[PDB]
């Protein structure tokens, strides 16, 4: 209901976790698990590469279509770009229904 | 200077003419050529089929381009179409420079 592709078998969840590295244990053996670990975190890169399958239009419409254009004007800031101090701001929600197939 | 493709050897001129069919000549021979033909005209169809060669864009522009769109509004008449009594009216001159290559 939020839109999208209802998948029976969706892309699987990729779960990630830092392996717990403990701090120094005491010299006598203890039964209680651990109240002290080494504080750590990870970083790294991650690539996602989705191949899509397009449906090219087969229209015999005469007049021009309505297509998503940028606002051609002397603007203060370029839309869908960074700012004076680097904040990527998406200005408006873009749908996908711009072309016209007859019903 | 009006724009276009300066060709050394352009498409050749196709010239067409009704063959003159004369009216009735007099019984005695005359030297003067003809002051009377049969009034006629032709009609028919004509096909012109130009194959063009396109140059697909190779851009790495981020933000959207400015493209030729139709005016999306409740309009009185659809642009580049016929009218209430069939007059094809081109409303505006359309150029071709809408895309952006860096200099």
Helices (H) and strands (E) in chain B, counts: 0, 0
**Chain A interface mutation, best of B59, B61, B64, highest count of A Cβ atoms under 10 Å:** B64
Method underlying the structure? cryo-EM
Residues B64, A70: C-beta atoms closer than 8 Å = yes
Q: What gap in Å lies between CA B90 and CA B83, rounded to an integer? A: 11
Burial of A80 (0-12, 13-18, 19+ CB in 10 A): middle
Sign (positive or negative) of CA dihedral B3, B7, B11, B13: positive
Residues A79 and A91: beta-carbon distance below 8 Å: yes
Give the number of other Cβ atoms within 10 Å of residue B57's Cβ.
Answer: 10
Among chain A residues, CA nearest to B81 = A63
Q: Which residues of A touch B63 (CB under 8 A)?
A: 70, 78-81
Of B64, B65, B69, the CB nearest to A64: B69
Q: Residue B37: beta bridge partners? A: B22
Two tokens at B15? Answer: 């010239």
For A15, A76, A85, A88, A98, the CA distances from A91, given in Å and listed in that order, are: 32, 13, 16, 9, 19
Q: Give the distance from residue A70's alpha carbon to the nearest chain B alpha carbon, in angstroms.
A: 6
Of B16, B11, B12, nearest in space to B43 by CA: B16
Residue with tokens 């050529």: B33
Residue with tokens 């750590």: A40
Residues B69, A70: C-beta atoms closer than 8 Å = no
Residues B96 and B90: beta-carbon distance below 8 Å: no
For B72, B77, B90, B93, the CA distances from B83, given in Å and listed in that order, are: 19, 7, 11, 18
The C-alpha R_g of chain B, in whole angstroms, comes to 26
């Amino acid at each position: 209901l939020m839109g999208g592709f209802g998948l029976k078998n969706p892309p699987p969840q990729i779960l990630i976790k830092n392996t717990p590295v403990p701090a120094n244990p005491p010299a006598e053996f203890s039964a209680t698990k651990f109240a002290s670990f080494i504080t750590q975190y990870s970083t790294g890169q991650v690539s996602v590469e989705i191949e899509w399958e397009l449906q090219k239009e087969n229209s015999k419409r005469w007049n021009p279509e309505v297509q998503y254009t940028s606002n051609y004007a002397k603007s203060a800031n370029v839309d869908f770009t960074v700012d004076n101090n680097g904040l990527y701001t998406e200005p408006r929600p873009i749908g996908t229904r711009y072309l016209t197939r007859p019903l």
